[PDB]
Amino acid sequence: INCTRPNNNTRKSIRIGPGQAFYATGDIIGDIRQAHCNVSKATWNETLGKVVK
Amino acid sequence: AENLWVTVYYGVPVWKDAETTLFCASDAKAYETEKHNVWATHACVPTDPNPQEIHLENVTEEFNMWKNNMVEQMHTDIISLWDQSLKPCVKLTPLCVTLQCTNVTNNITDDMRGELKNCSFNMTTELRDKKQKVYSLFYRLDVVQINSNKEYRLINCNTSACTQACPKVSFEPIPIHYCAPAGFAILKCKDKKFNGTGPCPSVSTVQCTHGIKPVVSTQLLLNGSLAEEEVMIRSENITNNAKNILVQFNTPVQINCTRPNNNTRKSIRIGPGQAFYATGDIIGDIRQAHCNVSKATWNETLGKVVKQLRKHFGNNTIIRFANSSGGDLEVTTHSFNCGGEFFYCNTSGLFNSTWISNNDSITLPCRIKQIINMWQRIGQCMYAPPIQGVIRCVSNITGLILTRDGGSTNSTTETFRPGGGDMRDNWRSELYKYKVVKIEPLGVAPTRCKRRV
Amino acid sequence: KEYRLINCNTSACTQACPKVSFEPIPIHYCAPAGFAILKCKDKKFNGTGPCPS
Amino acid sequence: AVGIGAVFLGFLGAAGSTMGAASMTLTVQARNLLSGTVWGIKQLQARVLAVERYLRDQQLLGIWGCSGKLICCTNVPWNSSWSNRNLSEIWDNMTWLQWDKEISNYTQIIYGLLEESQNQQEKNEQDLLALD
Amino acid sequence: AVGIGAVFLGFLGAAGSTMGAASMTLTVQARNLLSGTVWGIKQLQARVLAVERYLRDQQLLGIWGCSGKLICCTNVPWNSSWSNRNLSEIWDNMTWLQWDKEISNYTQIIYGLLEESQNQQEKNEQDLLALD
Amino acid sequence: AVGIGAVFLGFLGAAGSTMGAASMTLTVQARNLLSGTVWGIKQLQARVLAVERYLRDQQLLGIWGCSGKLICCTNVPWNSSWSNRNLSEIWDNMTWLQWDKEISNYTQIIYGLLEESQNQQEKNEQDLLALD
Amino acid sequence: QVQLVESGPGLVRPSETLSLTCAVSGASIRTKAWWSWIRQPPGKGLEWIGYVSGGWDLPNYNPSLKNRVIILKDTSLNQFSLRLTSVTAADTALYYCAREGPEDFDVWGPGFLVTVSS
Amino acid sequence: QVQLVESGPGLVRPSETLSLTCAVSGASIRTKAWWSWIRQPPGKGLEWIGYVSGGWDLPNYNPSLKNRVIILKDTSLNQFSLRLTSVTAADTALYYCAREGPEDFDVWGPGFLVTVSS
Ligand SMILES: *[C@@H]1O[C@H](CO)[C@@H](O[C@@H]2O[C@H](CO)[C@@H](O[C@@H]3O[C@H](CO[C@H]4O[C@H](CO)[C@@H](O)[C@H](O)[C@@H]4O)[C@@H](O)[C@H](O[C@H]4O[C@H](CO)[C@@H](O)[C@H](O)[C@@H]4O)[C@@H]3O)[C@H](O)[C@H]2NC(C)=O)[C@H](O)[C@H]1NC(C)=O
Ligand SMILES: *[C@@H]1O[C@H](CO)[C@@H](O[C@@H]2O[C@H](CO)[C@@H](O[C@@H]3O[C@H](CO)[C@@H](O)[C@H](O)[C@@H]3O)[C@H](O)[C@H]2NC(C)=O)[C@H](O)[C@H]1NC(C)=O
Ligand SMILES: *[C@@H]1O[C@H](CO)[C@@H](O[C@@H]2O[C@H](CO)[C@@H](O[C@@H]3O[C@H](CO)[C@@H](O)[C@H](O)[C@@H]3O)[C@H](O)[C@H]2NC(C)=O)[C@H](O)[C@H]1NC(C)=O
Ligand SMILES: *[C@@H]1O[C@H](CO)[C@@H](O[C@@H]2O[C@H](CO)[C@@H](O[C@@H]3O[C@H](CO)[C@@H](O)[C@H](O)[C@@H]3O)[C@H](O)[C@H]2NC(C)=O)[C@H](O)[C@H]1NC(C)=O
Ligand SMILES: *[C@@H]1O[C@H](CO)[C@@H](O[C@@H]2O[C@H](CO)[C@@H](O)[C@H](O)[C@H]2NC(C)=O)[C@H](O)[C@H]1NC(C)=O
Ligand SMILES: *[C@@H]1O[C@H](CO)[C@@H](O[C@@H]2O[C@H](CO)[C@@H](O)[C@H](O)[C@H]2NC(C)=O)[C@H](O)[C@H]1NC(C)=O
Ligand SMILES: *[C@@H]1O[C@H](CO)[C@@H](O)[C@H](O)[C@H]1NC(C)=O
Ligand SMILES: *[C@@H]1O[C@H](CO)[C@@H](O)[C@H](O)[C@H]1NC(C)=O
Ligand SMILES: *[C@@H]1O[C@H](CO)[C@@H](O)[C@H](O)[C@H]1NC(C)=O
Ligand SMILES: *[C@@H]1O[C@H](CO)[C@@H](O)[C@H](O)[C@H]1NC(C)=O
Ligand SMILES: *[C@@H]1O[C@H](CO)[C@@H](O)[C@H](O)[C@H]1NC(C)=O
């Protein structure tokens, strides 16, 4: 299985207080896409055949 | 007779070198003071008085203070104890605030800046709705200029929170005796002349070490164990210069240190049951903290260490001293904790001398930081409470920590500079005598006896 | 006429959790190995001295 | 020295003398092996490491011929390749440290020989008490 | 298998074989019983539970006839109602698991019989050394 | 009482009786000596103090003549200045508490005498097995 | 305040294994006590079967009971059980669980008639 | 730097139990040492009474002292005590506590005249 978030992220340090770091999300460098996973169709159909058997 | 059998002897005296944990021990006189106004006589067993220093004869063990254990364990124990004596005390998170600071009321010249800055600021009271305006004094080394008007902030307020030390617990050293547990013994090399590494021909086993008071000092280590007759220098390698040189001399040099500025502490209520101890009035003159030393005794001890240092570098060798080459504050000066307040005192007056092969008193000015960050952690700073009264202390200088400059290119002179470095070189000045061994019983040996059926 | 709480200038206060109740459950004390608890079973016994039973 | 004539003093005192002289003083090195809010964990792990080492030594003895006899003649022979020295010389000439340096290689085979000898003695005693 | 002929291998290796074959390999199951910031409490309670179980077993042995002999004939007889099988059959026919399933009921009376036998032997030996 | 005739009951039951009667019941006082997020430290230090005391007692026995015999005749004599009473009177007349009050002074010299006697017996047995 | 209550059959066939069990409340089993079984044939006197102890005594019976009596204590359930293997019809008797203490058999059980009949 | 100081009587009746006690400072008792008692009749030579050890040696005395001498060490108080039961007036002597070490009796006590008189 392959899984990815393709949205590139930039973290940003915001100082909450003395020595308190919070990590927010900055810019989306690039396209705004949707995170997704992939599996091979044939191997998944074959393994479903195996578990059916 | 030649049909030799074997025999197991249990309880054979033989040991090996090992690395195990250790055993705290404090004297019961420090236990007599109630509620632990020094750290951890409850986290440390009471010392059995006059324990067994049983001698060993015709025994040769190789000691090595540089790859020694238990100095790492002493460093870890003191660090963990210093952390464990702060978790009760008050965090100074609400103190990080915009400070309106001016100079202290003083007839200051424009050349010499005021070391003390008065600072007024907002502060929360016990009640959340009401805030108060309050003033205090701080040093130059604790405030920076955030950016007409002149407004400051504390130095630590953008790296870490600070924990104010409790005025109950004092930082004066009580002597720590280290003891081995069961199945281990501490061999003390009792040799008079012993340079820290190699075979010690006169050792003695022991169960508990001597009184090792943990002092915190960078150069000019204080109140240590002085040598028997000579002045002994010790190095892991004298030809190497990256390693320090621990100089332990015989006659302890008396040092007098004082802050003459009389101080009045002031309790400011941060919140419910939260006390902060600021500086109030300077009752009297505004003077500068200083540390004396005796001129003749210091010149004599420098002559002694020159006479001893010429052994490892040839007779016709010029030996000169210099001050520290730079870096952070607390390795340039020599720093310590007198009366529960920290001194950072300049040492250029003690190390301007050169030495050829053939009633006064040195004063040297100090500076007083109120916050400290010792051991150089990532997120901890200790604020120290200002103490009442003119403060003085007398101490016995025992040894130096020197460093040879990286001399090349065919020079007769070889200069020395005092370098603090790691704190472990203090404890390596007091754990050179001891090592820890594991007893292994049940040796086996051939003899002539057969077990009958 | 404005008030404050009584404790607010000596200490902070911890509100008790409504889960944990303060009603006493009986505690039995027991000795460990190598120790024994002697109970003076005398009827008339004023707390001090020889207990014959 | 002080303990001359009546050859004894405190523990590890015989460690410099020869092994023949040190053999008469073994009870105290056997003795000083057991007795002696986060530091309690250090104290406790030291104490249980001490009793674990002592129990391992007592179990190593107990599977051999001697439970607590503290000097045990046994039935395994001695390879003279191991010592390869004069027998009465080592009891007037060598320390236990030097002897343990000598037979450092020749270890852990002796213990299996001891276990084989003790199990053989046990099965022989079982047969002897069986046929009677 | 690999350990055929010279019948031994690692601990619990004889657990499948018969009790007669397993009786020759008992030293290692005796051996692997002792040696082996909040997790230190778990480690410590595991270690002290191990040494408490081992000391309870050694004390149960020590009040009987054998301190560390590891095979002990004794003076108590055997009720044949308990085993009620052929004697030499069980050493070639039964595992220790099946034998412990057999005498699960007939337990804890044997131990008091052993204690009575040992105390009787002790008072008899005290009388024997007293009148001499 | 209930245990009259067959003189036994639970542990510390014989503590009121005379030492001659109490001598027949010693196995249980020996038995009830070992078995029995910050409170775990208290439980653990209690358990390891119990096993440390038990191991110190077993080691004090093991360096004497008896490992686990629980009644040990030995080879040291008795100074009659210590007891200075009629011998058979104390086994029908005295409790163990009163006897321990009697010989409170005369202690810790007996133990060194026991160690000297055991080491002398060990060197005599070593010589006896050596010349054979 | 101790209370002993027997439980088990009162009608069994001869040449079988008889077993009762007496529950104990009001006190503890592991006391200075012999938890005992005592019987009585009907119209006749008592017959002490045996005891067991809450300490570590070995149980001692009447030798007339022919080694067929095993009294087993259950300290985890505060009970103690009589056994009688190979019974006969002449062993019909009231059975009693009791407690020997510093006084002699203070708290008994009520005592139940086991009538062994074929 | 060791310092030994005797304490006790100097005038006792004969046929009694004599006992001194020497306090030790400057070092430890449990060292490679025999903490010893040595006496001297007045005008005459020394007379070694006996010793005790800070290790685990059994104390060994002069057999001329007729087994009336028990030297007992007190490691919890850094002391060691002489005893002498059934004294006579001829046992009048200066008494000395001392320390046998790798050198021979370096630090003594000052030595006090016990004059046994009736
Ligand atoms: C540890 O201790 C040592 C020992 O004192 C300190 O070393 C001294 O440091 C100071 C400065 O840090 C050195 O500098 C001296 O400053 C004096 C004051 O400066 C005023 O005057 C000069 C003009 O001379 C102006 O430019 C300046 O803006 C100030 O208005 C000077 O007067 C000194 O000059 C000296 O040398 C010249 C040479 O021509 C002479 O003509 C002068 O009369 C005078 O003697 C000098 O510039 C001082 O030199 C150091 N002392 C020594 C003995 O060398 C360390 O600073 C201290 N460590 C730390 C961290 O502070
Ligand atoms: C302590 O808290 C008080 C209360 O907030 C602070 O006082 C206030 O500070 C602000 C910032 O300077 C003042 O605003 C400015 O005031 C000046 C002068 O009036 C005006 O010219 C500016 O335009 C701006 O409004 C505010 O007035 C002032 N309030 C009061 C009542 O003084 C104070 O700064 C805090 N710190 C200290 C050290 O007192
Ligand atoms: C070790 O000793 C030497 C002198 O032998 C010290 O050198 C001196 O260092 C100071 C500052 O570190 C120099 O002061 C200068 O003052 C002017 C005045 O305003 C300032 O503008 C400069 O920036 C500088 O601060 C001083 O000139 C210098 N001495 C010489 C002769 O050059 C050195 O600091 C000492 N090191 C330590 C750690 O004390
Ligand atoms: C280095 O060591 C010596 C301490 O013995 C100190 O050297 C001193 O340096 C000052 C510099 O102004 C000298 O002051 C003047 O020197 C000229 C000669 O150049 C002289 O004619 C003047 O009358 C005036 O004294 C001073 O004499 C000199 N000391 C000696 C004994 O010659 C200095 O304190 C040390 N360096 C540092 C950085 O601490
Ligand atoms: C998941 O991603 C991996 C990335 O490595 C793919 O593996 C590669 O697939 C290509 C296409 O067939 C091959 O040419 C490479 O040799 C493969 N490399 C490795 C290391 O396996 C994989 O095919 C992907 N799977 C799916 C189902 O998308
Ligand atoms: C450091 O301060 C101490 C303060 O006690 C000084 O010691 C005194 O010095 C004076 C002057 O010589 C003597 O009269 C006193 O007898 C000393 N008292 C004691 C207790 O020693 C010491 O001299 C100072 N040292 C230096 C180098 O300044
Ligand atoms: C899986 O593969 C078989 C063989 O080609 C096919 O008949 C079947 O329809 C496949 N399953 C799916 C869900 O496509
Ligand atoms: C140290 O004393 C000697 C002897 O008086 C003298 O020659 C030397 O110059 C002194 N050293 C210093 C740095 O004054
Ligand atoms: C022990 O074995 C090593 C090889 O591992 C060998 O070098 C050494 O010489 C041996 N020791 C002795 C004393 O022969
Ligand atoms: C063990 O006793 C139980 C009764 O508790 C009985 O059911 C079982 O059959 C007995 N076991 C054997 C092997 O007879
Ligand atoms: C034990 O010794 C003390 C002296 O310490 C003495 O008073 C006491 O009488 C002695 N005990 C007996 C029973 O004599």
Alpha-carbon torsion D63, D68, D70, D71, what sign? negative
Of B345, B350, B349, B351, the closest CA to residue B393 belongs to B345
Q: Between the CA atoms of B105, B106, B111 and B112, what dihedral angle is there, to the nearest 10 degrees? A: -100
Residues C18 and G33: their CA atoms lie apart, in Å, by 47
Structure tokens at F7: 């003189």
| Distance in Å, CA B299 to ligand 8 centroid | 6
**Best residue among D103, D104, D105, D108 to mutate for probing ligand 9, ranked by most atoms within 8 Å of CB:** D105
DSSP letter at E33 equals T
Kindly report the nearest CA distance between residue F19 and chain G, in angstroms. Answer: 19
D76, D117 contact by CB (below 8 A): yes
| B322, B351 Cβ separation under 8 angstroms | yes
- B405 vs B324: CA distance, rounded Å: 11
Query: SS3 for G90?
Result: helix
Chains that touch A (3 or more CB pairs under 8 A): B
B144: nearest Cα among B135, B136, B153: B153
What amino acid occupies position C51? Answer: C
CA of F81 to the centre of ligand 11 (A): 13
Nearest chain H Cα distance for residue D1, angstroms:
5
Q: Decide if B10 contacts B445 (C-beta within 8 A).
A: no
Q: How far is the CA of B352 from the centre of ligand 1 (A)?
A: 15
Whether residue F38 contacts residue E38, with contact meaning beta carbons closer than 8 Å, is answered with no
**H/E run at residue F8:** none
Residue type at A13 in one-letter notation:
S
Identify residues of F whose CB sits under 8 angstroms from chain H CBs. 112-113, 115-116
Q: Is the CB of B348 under 6 A from ligand 1?
A: yes
Query: Phi then psi for B263, rounded to 5 degrees?
Result: -120, 150
> From the centroid of its chain, how far is CA H1?
20
Q: Which of G53, G57, G58 is the best substitution to test chain E (most E C-beta atoms within 10 A)?
A: G58
- Which region, left, alpha or beta, applies to residue B272 given φ > 0 means left and ψ of -120 to 50 means alpha? beta
**B120 within ligand 2 shell (Cβ under 6 A):** yes
| Pairwise CB contact (< 8 Å): F10 & G100 | no
Crossing angle for the helix pair E39-62 and F39-62, to the nearest 10 degrees: 30
Which among B438, B429, B428, B439 is positioned nearest to B70, based on CA atoms?
Answer: B428
DSSP assignment string, chain A: -EEE----EEEEEEEEETTEEEEEEEEE-S-----EEE--HHHHHHHHHHHH-
Interface list for chain F against chain D, based on CB atoms closer than 8 Å:
38, 41, 44-45, 48, 51-52, 55-56, 59, 62-63, 67-68, 115, 119, 122-123, 126, 129
Instruction: Write D2-7 long-range contacts (CB < 8 A, 24+).
Output: D2/H32, D2/H33, D2/H34, D2/H100, D2/H101, D2/H102, D3/H32, D3/H34, D3/H53, D3/H55, D3/H57, D6/H57, D6/H60
d(CA F44, CA F41): 5
> Hunting for tokens 């007996």 — which residue is that?
F110
Q: What is the DSSP letter of B180?
A: -
List the strands of the sheet with D71-77, edge to edge.
B443-447, B5-9, D71-77
Q: Is D75 left (phi over 0), alpha (psi -120 to 50) or beta?
A: alpha
Closest-CA residue, ligand 9 atom 12, reads: D102
B255 and B270 Cβ atoms separated by less than 8 Å: no
The dihedral sign for the CA sequence B179, B180, B182, B188: negative
Q: F48: which DSSP letter?
A: H
Q: Residue D97: how many CB atoms within 10 A of its CB?
A: 19
**Bridge partners of residue H14, in order along the sequence:** none
At B355, list the tokens: 């030495």
SS3 readout for E51-119: HHHHHHHHHHHHCCCCCCCCCCCCCCCCCHHHHCCCHHHHHHHCCHHHHHHHCCCCCCCHHHHHHHHHH
Residue of E nearest to D46 (CA): E44
Contact E65, E74 (CB under 8 A): yes
Ligand 4 atom nearest B323 alpha carbon: 38
Q: How far apart are the first and last CA of chain D?
A: 57
Residues 6 or more apart in contact with residue B258 via CB below 8 angstroms: B289, B290, B291, B390, B391, B392, B393
Size of interface A-B (CB pairs under 8 A): 17
- Number of Cβ within 10 Å of residue E101's Cβ equals 10
List of chain D residues whose C-beta atoms are within 8 Å of the C-beta of residue E31? 59, 63
With touching defined as 3+ CB pairs under 8 A, do chains E and H touch?
no
Q: Which two tokens stand for residue E92?
A: 């070639």
CA distance B317 to B407: 13
- Interface contact flag, C8 B126, Cβ < 8 Å: yes
Ligand nearest, relative to CA of residue D104: 9
Element containing residue B371 per DSSP (H, E): strand B371-372
CA distance E108 to B59: 56
Three-state SS for D31?
A: helix
Q: Which residues of H11-47 are buried (b: 16+ CB within 10 A; e: fewer)?
A: ebeeeeebebbbbbeebbbbbbbbbbbbbbeeeeeeb
Q: How far is the CA of B322 from the centre of ligand 4 (A)?
A: 14
Residue F12, Cα to own-chain centre: how many angstroms? 15
* Numbered residues of chain D with Cβ closer than 8 Å to any chain E Cβ: 38, 41, 44-45, 48, 51-52, 55-56, 59, 62-63, 67, 115, 119, 122-123, 125-126, 129
- Do H100 and D11 count as a contact with CB atoms less than 8 A apart? no
Q: Following DSSP, what letter does each residue of B199-225 receive, concatenated?
A: EESSEEEESB---B-----SSSEES-P
DSSP conformation letters of B11-72: T---EEE-----EEEE-HHHHSSTT-SBS-SSSSEEPPSS----B--S--EEEESSS-SSHH
Coil vs helix vs strand at G81 = strand
Measured in Å, how far apart are chain A's first and last C-alpha atoms?
Answer: 23
- Named by the residue before each, gaps in chain F exceeding 2.5 A from C to N are 36
Angle at B246 between CA B245 and CA B249, to 5 degrees: 130
In B124-193, which ranges are continuous DSSP H helix?
Answer: none
What is the chain E residue with the closest CA to G70? E109
Contact between chain B and chain D (3 or more Cβ pairs less than 8 Å apart): yes
Q: Do chains D and H touch (3 or more CB pairs under 8 A)?
A: yes
| Closest by Cα among D10, D57, D111, D76 to B441 | D57
Sequence-distant (6+) residues with CB within 8 A of D128 are: none
CA–CA separation, B64 and B205 (whole Å): 16
Name the token pair of B105: 């009321």
Closest Cα partner for G114 from G86, G81, G90?
G90
Angle, CA of D102, D106 and D111, to the nearest 5° = 130
User: Whole-angstrom Cα distance, residue A41 to residue A46?
Assistant: 9
Which one of E34, E53, E59, E111 would you mutate to disrupt binding with F, by most F Cβ within 10 Å of its Cβ?
A: E59
For residue D44, what are the CA distances in angstroms to B437, D51, E41, F47? Answer: 20, 11, 10, 11
The first and second tokens of residue B283, run together, are 């009752």
Name the closest-CA residue to atom 10, ligand 8: B299
How do H34-40 and H3-7 pair as beta strands?
unpaired
Question: Do residue D3 and residue H101 have CB atoms under 8 angstroms apart?
Answer: no
**Hunting for tokens 């025992």 — which residue is that?**
B398
Residues facing residue B438 across a β-bridge: B16, B184
Tokens representing G45? Answer: 């006197």
Q: Are B17 and B437 in contact (CB under 8 A)?
A: yes
Distance, CA of H11 to CA of H114 (rounded, Å): 6
The DSSP code for G45 is: -
Element containing residue F129 per DSSP (H, E): helix F110-131
* Contact (Cβ atoms closer than 8 angstroms) between residue B332 and residue B324: yes
Report yes or no on chains B and H touching (3+ CB pairs under 8 A): yes
Report which DSSP code applies to E46: H
Q: What angle do CA B397, B400, B402 make, to 5 degrees?
A: 165
The overall longest dimension of chain C from CA atoms, in Å, is 67
Discontinuities after residues in chain B (C–N over 2.5 A): 147, 358
CA quadruple D88, D89, D91, D92: dihedral, nearest 10: 120
Question: What is the C-alpha to C-alpha distance for residues B200 and C51, in angstroms, rounded to an integer?
Answer: 64
Alpha carbon of D77 to those of B448, D62, F119: distances in Å? 10, 20, 25
Tell me which residue of F7, B240, D61, D2 sits closest to H102, measured CA to CA. D2
Cβ atoms of residues B282 and B389 within 8 Å: no
* CA C12 – CA B185 distance, rounded (Å): 49
Quote the CA–CA distance of B5 and F132 in Å, as a whole number. Answer: 13
What's B94's DSSP letter?
Answer: G
B11 has a chain H CB within 8 A of its CB:
no
Residue G44 Cα, gap to closest chain E Cα (Å): 34
Tell me how the structure was determined.
cryo-EM
Dihedral pair phi/psi, residue E23, rounded to 5°:
-70, -25
Beta-strand runs (E) in chain G: 3-7, 11-12, 18-19, 21-25, 34-40, 47-53, 72-74, 79-81, 83-84, 93-100, 112-116
Report d(CA B431, CA D32) in Å as an integer.
24
Check residue F26 and give left, alpha or beta (phi > 0: left; psi -120 to 50: alpha). alpha
> Which residues have C-beta within 8 Å of that of residue B291, sequence separation ≥ 6?
B255, B256, B257, B258, B343, B345, B363, B364, B366
Q: How far is CA D33 from the centre of its chain?
A: 13
Q: Which element (helix H / strand E) includes F65?
A: none
Helix or strand run (H / E) with residue B252: strand B245-259
Interchain pair H57, D8: CB under 8 A: yes
Q: Which two tokens stand for residue C42?
A: 């005398």
Task: Specify the amino acid at residue B299.
Answer: N
G83, G71 contact by CB (below 8 A): yes
Sign of CA dihedral B220, B224, B230, B236: negative
d(CA G81, CA G9): 13
Angle at which helices D39-62 and E39-62 cross, to 10°: 30
Handedness of CA B105, B107, B110, B112 (dihedral sign): negative
DSSP F12: T
| Strand partners of residue G23 | G5, G79
Lookup: tokens for A9? 């992220």
Residues of E in contact with D40 (CB under 8 A): none
Determine whether B220 is exposed, middle or buried from the number of CB atoms within 10 Å of its CB (0-12, 13-18, 19+). buried
Q: What are phi and psi of D55, to 5 degrees?
A: -70, -35
Residue B34 CB neighbour total at 10 angstroms: 6
E112, closest residue in chain G (CA to CA): G58
* Tokens, residue G77: 């359930």
* Phi, psi of H90, deg, nearest 5: -80, -5
Tell me which ligand sits closest to the C-alpha of residue B359. 6
Please state, in angstroms and rounded to a whole number, the distance separating the CA atoms of residues B421 and B426: 10
Q: Give DSSP secondary structure letters for chain H.
A: --EEEEES-SEE-SSS-EE-EEEEESS-SSSS-EEEEEEE-TTS--EEEEEEESSSPPP-B-GGGTT----EEETTTTEEE-EE-S--GGG-EEEEEEEE-SSSS-SB---EEEEE--
Number of Cβ atoms within 10 Å of the Cβ of F90? 17
Among residues B273, B294, B218, the alpha carbon closest in space to that of B88 is found at B273
Q: Is residue B156 a contact partner of residue B162, using CB atoms and an 8 Å limit?
A: yes
Ligand 5 atom nearest to CA at A2? 1
CA distances (Å), B199 to each of B66, B234, B434, F84, H52, in order? 14, 15, 13, 58, 34
Q: How far is CA F1 from CA E122, F4, F16, H33, in A?
A: 26, 5, 13, 57
Residues 6+ apart with CB under 8 A from G105: G36, G38, G98, G99
Distances (CA, A) of G64 to G48, G53, G68: 10, 20, 10
The type of residue at E101 is K
C-alpha distance from residue D9 to each of B52, D16, H25, H106 (Å): 12, 12, 21, 18
Task: Round to whole Å and give the CA distance between H57 and H34.
Answer: 9
What is the dihedral sign for C-alpha D92, D93, D99, D102?
A: negative
Give the E-state strand segments of B86-175 in sequence order: 99-103, 116-124, 131-139, 143-145, 151-154, 162-164
In contact, B338 and B257? CB cutoff 8 Å: yes
What's the rounded Cα separation, in Å, for the pair B174 and B40? 10
Q: Is the CB of B353 under 6 A from ligand 8?
A: yes
Amino acid at B67: K
Of B352, B360, B364, the one to substitute when testing ligand 4's pocket (max ligand atoms within 8 A of C-beta) is: B352
Reported as type and span, the H/E element at residue E122 is helix E110-131
